[PDB]
From a paper:
Parasite-infected red blood cells sequester in the placenta through interaction between parasite-expressed protein VAR2CSA and the glycosaminoglycan chondroitin sulfate A (CS) abundantly present in the intervillous space. Here, we report cryo-EM structures of the VAR2CSA ectodomain at up to 3.1 Å resolution revealing an overall V-shaped architecture and a complex domain organization. Compared to other PfEMP1s, the ~310 kDa VAR2CSA ectodomain is relatively conserved among parasites. Several of the DBL domains are linked by complex inter-domain (ID1-3) regions with limited or no homology among PfEMP1s yielding a DBL1-ID1-DBL2-ID2-DBL3-DBL4-ID3-DBL5-ID4-DBL6 structure.
As the binding to CSPG in NaCl buffer showed a 1:2 stoichiometry compared to a 1:1 in KCl buffer, the less compact VAR2CSA could introduce more unspecific binding or the proposed additional minor groove binding site is more exposed in NaCl buffer allowing CSPG binding. The final model represents the ectodomain of VAR2CSA, exhibiting a well-folded conformation with clearly defined DBL domains and in agreement with previously published structures of DBL3, DBL4 and DBL6. The structure discloses the fold of ID2, forming a separate domain consisting of a bundle of α-helices, a shape which together with ID3, a 30 residues long α-helix (residue 1955-1985), serves as a structural glue for the core. Notably, ID2 and ID3 interact, as the C-terminus of ID2 forms an open-mouth shape conformation, which interacts extensively with the ID3 α-helix.
Author numbering: 6 to 241, 258 to 409, 500 to 527, 556 to 633, 641 to 734, 748 to 786, 798 to 856, 873 to 928, ...
The structure:
């Protein structure tokens, strides 16, 4: 076995060993041993394996906590354990092996490996730990030293796993272990059960397994090696990407390997001695020995001389003895004895013994070739032939604050051609294997006079040898290289670009002398070796930080004492290059601070300057001849076309190297994005003075928090914004377009690098554009349906008509019509709403423009629906539209199309839909018309005396009068406001009817002998008096609405000079009189019913209804009357005389004229003001529970105030309940809490449905609602899993609903014109359990830096209980424990991510809870003045830093785990196969997560409903009805969501709609994203959707408009049964309408 020829046949047992396909184990299976294992987190990159893969307690990093590789000159050569008795050293053992990081394999005693895969994972973990301990600990030359040491440890591991160990130690403990696991493996496989030769076939089968997994183990063990290591001396890199085990060292004999090891270790250390005896060589005695001065400076020379002598003597003895031990077996190889016999194997030791001992005295060419042997001499005889300029600072990059030019200055210090992109460089100019073809080495770099050098010391042809001994000589070599290169470059180019390219070349040197060259060539990776071993001699003596304290003063790690050397002395390099290319004079001390930028980024900026210069040259002519296009500029546009479209043809740009610009940009984007993602997950960031320190990772992490993902954005930031293009096309605006492939309609999105420059797309081939497309590209309104005598079908989109026959009955294309119409009719209706809410004038023109589109579409649909009915005449678009608009409601709340007990919603529907009971389609025409009309005196003695009205008292008598208050009269009464709905306001009750009514003994209508005129005049006078009284009542602050906080009830004054809320009071009083005049739901005074009767009589006698018209006419009269009132009052007022422009020039609008609605609004404002007053009083009385006895309840002051609040809220509970249910019934869809919140900003902190909570626990555990917080002084503490007491009933939110649907509501209105929509809240997220947060948050408003404690506690509590309840909702609601556990784990992870986004404030919902929660988080973390982005950063990293060794999003995850454990224990099951991971990754953007969840649940429901319907089909009416009722509303979901995706994909934190950082999503379309996302299993982590043969994933969009094949088989039956159901349900609805009409 020469190890070169015999082995290739003795090897090759990994291809003809079909067991290998099952013996090729691999990690990346389901969670490993429930100890943090994972599948994808390793298949993506096997390198990033952690200890948490088998048990991490037994399998921790090797627990031999004996100093590794940093020890004395220990060499087990003497009597140590058994070697030394008769055989002094059985085998040449270095300390390296004794530190072989296999103590992970001492504590492996366990059996459930259940695959070769887990055992592979264990051994690979050991290999990776060994590789790390090697690389971080190897103070040496050190390139060859570290590389050889790594491969030698790999070969030692090979022997160990193969069992061919020769060192004796604690191996049997793991030896019989690996025996038993291998036995387990061979009993797992039937094919390998063909191999049971005793003993368990250790040797042969372990060799087979080693040859099966050697590739993986070698690949991983070298992963922890920096790229600038040059591992393998075959491509002499990092040796990691060799794609095959490059070394054969694992195959050489173990004992031969170790004797070579040992001789080379002696060799390295003896060269160390021969050079370090020259430390004080100025006084080292190369002459007569002197020791008279008595110091350790001259006698040391002889000391080390004799030490080296004794070393060589002892090594001589041990060498010759080792020779004998491998030789004294001559006449006994082989007998079967174990006295002094060494037995190694049957294939590799035999040839060794017969060659090197029997017939040959010494060994052969191999060990002579690579490992040198006679540096001093060979003294072993198994091989013969013995030959016997600075020293200064580093920098940590203080970075600036985004001044649009991206130049980080400097930081702390220290004391002492043609852009070939081809592929990873094989044997010529290319890129390193990391950057196979991603950024594309520019042509100036190649041929830079240094990469054109095999060796630096070959500075010039004139010099023959090396002067590099002193620092100055090496620095001068660098200087002359720099000067010559500058000369060459100036020779090249001619100017201003000169300095730019000179800066780039300077950065190239600055990276080469730091060894991080992204590229490489035939003269690279060897000059790099020369640089390293040169630095080893001079400036190589300070590398002594492979230690435990590191002293932070020697800066010792080859790079640091190399890159630090570069940071210094680069002033001299740059000046010399300036003194090279003669552009020297102070033009461009000054240093080009660009070298700190990663070389990849500048290889981007270069080649972007190239593309820009070419493009601006090619467009400058274009922008001329297209001037509106004048006559003929299509030719030069076509030149630009072909330039930017060429697949590297002759006609086209240069630098693209073949593939067109689009593909190359895509590669660049992928590389940059994955760099961003790698930078996201790493624990290194900006430290000395709050600055990002170091190499690519930290710099990229600095870009994040500035955005600057999507290299387009980077470019837009760092470019000059004018280098390319007369058309200032920004690097945002991806500008979609399509082209042919160079199968014909392929599309692309290059941002300012698509054909047809920025605006001149229309202008090419002049065709002066019309108004429609100028709207279309703006994407203003986008009705994408394209209707253009059969049916003239209104096609939706690029989903072509596929008419199918399953069948005057319905037949073929016929059905499609209805269904298409069914969707169009639906969607357009829905569509109309948003654009109704929509409305410079450009969008107005767009709005008109799509209006006639819709009008014509409706015209054609109406036309051909008549044709449809005509075919089916042997159901009229007035029946059907009515039915469908009713169906919207009946499916929204009900599902259930039978129970019709509304009796109040009926009015709302008939106003909306069904006047005259399904007679007319006019709802649609009316909506269209509405879309059309949306194209955007008493200053006399006004003694208005009343004998029966005095100062207002309903809110208490005016000061100093105390008491006399009124309350809210309620369900139907007589004395005040006979009204079945909302309760009666006290202000209404004390209305001051004036002289309009009197008593005269008690009770009397005095308006009996009057007519219109004097009655109205008396009304006017009464209004005057009552508004004067109201104004006085509000000036004094007696009015509850008028009272402010602790201030004198007048601190808030409106910007009109009027008492607070007195505006609203006057408006409500006017509304009260208005609704009183005509018969409405008001009787608001003793017997006003007779007053409406009196009006009806006294008016409807002379006019001949007419009361209504007369009131409408005199409405302006009475409103100008109250205007004149306010004028005279404010001129009587001590302030300035205001005008009739008191709030409302016209009377209050008829919209907010529903007396119930106005009453409710007034009540809500009253309630908010009183709640705030009570809260103020509480915080006054609950800030010093003071002196509480257990349990520590409120002690009477806090207790009394808070109990007053409790009683108040107790009665307002039923009050608000009744009022809100009446309102919501009357105003279906809208919510009372909103109405209050926008109409009254006074209560934003108020949270109805919580202060008025209905759950009993949320009353008994919450005795004071929201104020069951700080009112209750108990200092709630979170309890972990183990705690004897639990969080039982602490936050017992009810069990989650299962079938509540997605909502577009509560989506935040984002900013100026951003306005995200088409995004809908996932069900589980909107029914999120977060209630316990709200109360203490109210307490948390005060007491910063102490509230965060409570926040952490409540987050843990709520996370735990939420996980418990969500698991309960998923898992025990089912028995398929595998997939149920997977789905529950996915839901829990999604919930955790949503909660984290809430903490980070990146959540998109702003419902009553989350809105206030986010506001309070901002006010808490943002102390007083921090910018919004800074507040986000603070509440983000506070979420990211630990309290005690564990970060917030680790404690929360633990709370989730403990909640799941409670759920499992209660259900009495096993812990899930998921949920056990102790380290989850980072979250995709919440929109992406919601999209994934939506697809998952949609495919689930589809596979359920369609299967049910197919199985069913007389009765399957219910089945396909369920299917189609779930489908259609779910269809508009997808359209809006896909539209939003297309708006936001590949955009980064400064160009996406939201500020949220996207662009980890590289997919042109959402369909392409999903089919490339979860086309597989549904495992607990990172694959959470799973869709299967939905049409037997573009059939996703195909089926939403139910047109695909898989449904066409049943479409005909389903449409007929649907139509019959429509007929019967229409009958029912008209019957119900007729029923209500009485």
């Amino acid at each position: 076995t020469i190890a070169n020829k015999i082995e290739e046949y003795l090897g090759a047992k990994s291809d003809d060993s079909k067991i290998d396909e099952l013996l090729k184990a691999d990690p990346s299976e389901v969670e490993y041993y429930r100890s943090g294992g994972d599948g994808d987190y390793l298949k993506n990159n096997i390198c990033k394996i952690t200890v948490n893969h088998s048990d991490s307690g037994k399998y921790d990093p090797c627990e031999k906590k004996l100093p590794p590789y940093d020890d004395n000159d220990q060499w087990k050569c003497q009597q140590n354990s058994s070697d030394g008795s008769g055989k002094p050293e059985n085998i040449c053992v270095p300390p390296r092996r004794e530190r072989l990081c296999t103590y992970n394999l001492e504590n492996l005693k366990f059996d459930k490996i259940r695959d070769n895969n887990a055992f592979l994972a264990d051994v690979l973990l050991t290999a990776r730990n060994e590789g790390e301990k090697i690389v971080q600990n190897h103070p040496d030359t050190n390139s060859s030293n570290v590389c050889n040491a790594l491969e030698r440890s790999f070969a030692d591991l090979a022997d160990i796993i193969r069992g061919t160990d020769q060192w004796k130690g604690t191996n049997s403990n793991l030896e019989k272990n690996l025996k038993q696991m291998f036995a387990k493996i061979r009993e797992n496989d039937k094919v390998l059960q063909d191999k049971y030769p005793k003993d368990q076939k250790y040797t042969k089968l372990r060799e087979a397994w080693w040859n099966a997994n050697r590739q993986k183990v070698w690949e991983v063990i070298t992963c922890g090696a920096r790229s600038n290591d040059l591992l393998i001396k075959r491509g002499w890199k990092c040796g990691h990407y060799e794609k095959e085990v490059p070394t054969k060292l694992d195959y050489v004999p173990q004992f031969l390997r170790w004797l070579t090891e040992w001789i080379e270790d002696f060799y390295r250390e003896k060269q160390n001695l021969i050079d370090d005896m020259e430390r004080h060589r100025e006084e080292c005695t190369r002459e007569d020995h002197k020791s008279k001065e008595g110091t350790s400076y001259c006698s040391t020379c002889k000391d080390k001389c004799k030490k080296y002598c004794e070393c060589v003597k002892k090594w001589k003895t041990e060498w010759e003895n080792q020779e004998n031990k491998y030789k004294d077996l001559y006449e006994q190889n082989k007998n079967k004895t174990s006295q002094k016999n060494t037995s190694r194997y049957d294939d590799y030791v035999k040839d060794f013994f017969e060659k090197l001992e029997a017939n040959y005295s010494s060994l052969e060419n191999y060990i002579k070739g690579d490992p040198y042997f006679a540096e001093y001499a060979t003294k072993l005889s198994f091989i013969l032939n013995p030959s016997d300029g600075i020293l200064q600072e580093n920098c940590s990059d203080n970075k600036r604050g985004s001044s649009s030019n991206d130049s980080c200055d400097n930081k702390n210090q220290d004391e002492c051609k043609k852009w070939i992109w081809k592929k990873s460089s094989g044997n010529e100019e290319g890129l390193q294997e990391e950057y196979a073809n991603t950024i594309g080495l520019p042509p100036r770099t190649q041929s830079l006079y240094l990469g054109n050098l095999p060796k630096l010391e070959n500075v010039c042809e004139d010099v023959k040898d090396i002067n590099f001994d002193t620092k100055e000589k090496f620095l001068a070599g660098c200087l002359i290289v720099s000067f010559h290169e500058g000369k060459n470059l100036k020779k090249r180019y001619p100017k201003e670009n000169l300095c730019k390219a000179l800066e780039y070349s300077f950065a190239d040197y600055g990276d080469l002398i730091k060894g991080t060259s992204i590229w490489d060539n035939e003269y690279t990776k060897d000059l790099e070796l020369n640089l390293q071993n040169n630095f080893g001699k001079l400036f190589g003596k300070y590398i002594k930080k492979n230690n435990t304290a590191e002293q932070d003063t020697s800066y010792s790690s080859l790079d640091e004492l190399r890159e630090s050397w570069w940071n210094t002395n680069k002033k001299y390099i740059w000046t010399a290059m300036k003194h090279g290319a003669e552009m020297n004079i102070t033009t461009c001390d000054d240093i080009p601070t660009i070298d700190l930028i990663p070389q990849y980024l500048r290889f981007l900026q270069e080649w972007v300057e190239n593309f820009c210069e070419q493009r601006q040259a090619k467009v400058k002519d274009v922008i001329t001849n297209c001037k509106e296009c004048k006559t003929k500029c299509k030719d030069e546009c076509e030149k630009y076309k072909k330039f930017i479209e060429a697949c590297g043809t002759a006609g086209g740009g240069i630098g693209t190297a073949g593939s067109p610009w689009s593909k190359r940009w895509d590669q660049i984007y992928k590389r940059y994005s994955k760099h961003i993602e790698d930078a996201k997950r790493n624990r290194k960031a900006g430290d000395e003075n709050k600055c990002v320190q170091s190499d690519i990772d930290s710099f990229f992490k600095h870009l994040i928090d500035i955005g600057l993902t999507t290299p387009s954005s980077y470019l837009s930031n760092v470019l000059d914004d004018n280098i390319c293009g007369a058309d200032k096309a920004p690097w945002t605006t991806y500008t979609t377009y399509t082209t042919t492939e160079k199968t014909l309609v392929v599309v692309n999105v290059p941002s300012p690098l698509g054909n047809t420059p920025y605006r001149y797309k229309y202008a090419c081939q002049c065709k002066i554009p019309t108004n429609e497309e100028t709207c279309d590209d703006r994407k203003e309104y986008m009705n994408q349906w394209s209707c253009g005598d059969n049916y003239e079908l209104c096609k939706y989109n690029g989903v072509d008509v596929k008419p199918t026959t399953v069948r005057s009955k319905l037949d073929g294309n016929d059905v499609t019509f209805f269904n298409l119409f069914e969707q169009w009719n639906k969607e357009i209706q829905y569509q109309i709403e948003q654009y109704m809410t929509n409305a410079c004038k450009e969008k107005c023109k767009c709005y008109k423009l799509w209006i006639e589109k819709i009008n014509d579409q409706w015209g054609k649909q109406k036309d051909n629906y008549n044709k449809f009915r005509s075919k089916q005449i042997y159901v009229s678009l007035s029946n059907f539209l009515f039915f469908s608009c009713w169906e919207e409601y009946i499916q929204k709340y009900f599902n259930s199309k039978i129970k019709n007990i509304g009796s109040d919603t009926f009015e709302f529907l008939i106003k909306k839909c069904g006047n005259n009971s399904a007679h007319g389609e006019e709802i649609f025409s009316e909506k269209l018309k509405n879309a059309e009309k949306k194209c955007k005196s008493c200053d006399l003695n006004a003694t208005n005396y009343i004998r029966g009205c005095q100062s207002k008292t309903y809110d208490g008598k005016i000061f100093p009068g105390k008491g006399g208050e009124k309350q809210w009269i309620c369900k139907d009464t007589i004395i005040h406001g006979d009204t079945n709905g909302a309760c009666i306001p006290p202000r209404t009750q004390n209305l001051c009817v004036g002289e309009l009514w009197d008593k005269s003994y008690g009770g009397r209508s005095n308006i009996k002998n009057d007519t219109k005129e004097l009655l109205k005049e008396k009304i006017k006078n009464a209004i005057h008096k009552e508004t004067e009284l109201l104004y006085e009542y509000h000036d004094t602050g007696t009015a509850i609405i008028s009272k402010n906080d602790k201030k004198g009830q007048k601190g808030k004054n409106d910007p009109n000079g009027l008492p607070k809320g007195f505006c609203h009071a006057v408006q409500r009083s006017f509304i009260d009189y208005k609704n009183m005049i005509l018969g409405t739901s008001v009787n608001i005074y003793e017997h006003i019913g007779k007053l409406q009767e009196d009006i009806k009589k006294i008016i409807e006698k002379g006019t001949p209804e007419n009361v209504n018209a007369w009131w409408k006419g005199i409405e302006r009269e009475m409103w100008d009357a109250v205007r004149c009132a306010i004028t005279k009052i404010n001129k009587k007022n001590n302030n300035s005389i205001f005008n009739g422009d008191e709030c409302g020039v016209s009377p209050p609008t008829g919209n907010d004229e529903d007396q119930s609605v106005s009453w409710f609004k007034e009540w809500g404002e009253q309630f908010c003001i009183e709640r705030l007053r009570y809260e103020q009083n509480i915080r006054e009385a609950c800030t010093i529970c003071i002196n509480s006895k257990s349990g520590d309840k409120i002690q009477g002051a806090c207790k009394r105030k808070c109990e007053k609040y409790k009683k108040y809220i107790s009665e307002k509970k039923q009050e608000w309940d009744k009022q809100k249910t009446k309102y919501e019934n009357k105003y279906v869809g809208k919510s009372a809490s909103d109405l209050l919140k926008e109409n009254y900003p006074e209560c934003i902190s108020a949270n109805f449905d919580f202060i008025f909570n209905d759950n009993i626990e949320y009353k008994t555990y919450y005795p004071y609602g929201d104020y069951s917080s700080i009112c209750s002084c108990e200092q709630v503490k979170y309890y972990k899993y183990n705690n004897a007491e639990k969080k039982n009933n602490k936050s017992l939110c009810y069990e989650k609903d299962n079938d509540m649907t997605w909502s577009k509501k509560y989506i935040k209105k984002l900013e100026n014109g951003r306005s995200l929509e088409g995004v809908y809240v996932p069900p589980r997220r909107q029914q999120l359990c977060l209630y316990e947060l709200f109360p203490i948050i109210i307490k948390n408003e005060e007491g910063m830096e102490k509230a965060k404690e409570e926040l952490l506690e409540t987050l843990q509590i709520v996370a735990e209980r939420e996980a418990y309840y969500l698991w309960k909702q998923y898992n025990p609601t089912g028995k398929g424990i595998d997939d149920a556990n997977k789905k529950a784990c996915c839901a829990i992870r999604g919930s955790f991510y949503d909660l984290e986004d809430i903490i980070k404030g990146n959540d998109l919902v702003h419902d009553e809870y989350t809105k206030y929660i986010d506001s309070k988080l901002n006010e808490i973390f943002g102390s007083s003045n921090t910018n919004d982005i800074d507040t986000k950063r603070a509440r983000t990293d506070w979420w990211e830093n630990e309290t005690d060794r564990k970060t917030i999003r680790q404690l929360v995850w633990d709370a989730m785990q403990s909640g799941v454990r409670y759920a499992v224990e209660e259900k009495n099951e096993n812990f899930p196969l998921c949920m056990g991971v102790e380290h989850i990754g980072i979250a995709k953007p919440q929109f992406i997560r919601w999209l994934e969840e939506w697809t998952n649940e949609f495919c689930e429901k589809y596979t359920k409903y369609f299967e049910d319907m197919k199985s069913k089909c007389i009765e399957c009416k219910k089945a396909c009805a369920n299917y189609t009722n779930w489908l259609n509303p779910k269809r508009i979901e997808w359209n809006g969501m896909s539209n939003y995706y297309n708006k936001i994909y590949r955009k980064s934190n400064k160009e996406s709609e939201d500020g949220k950082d996207y662009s980890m999503i590289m997919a042109p379309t959402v369909i392409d994203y999903l089919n490339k996302r979860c086309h597989g299993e549904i495992n607990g982590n990172y694959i959470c959707c799973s869709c299967k043969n939905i049409g037997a994933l573009d059939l996703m969009n195909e089926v939403l408009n139910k047109m695909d094949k898989k449904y066409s088989a049943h479409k005909m039956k389903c449409t007929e049964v649907y139509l019959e159901h429509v007929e019967e349900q229409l009958n029912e609805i008209d019957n119900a309408i007729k029923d209500y009409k009485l």
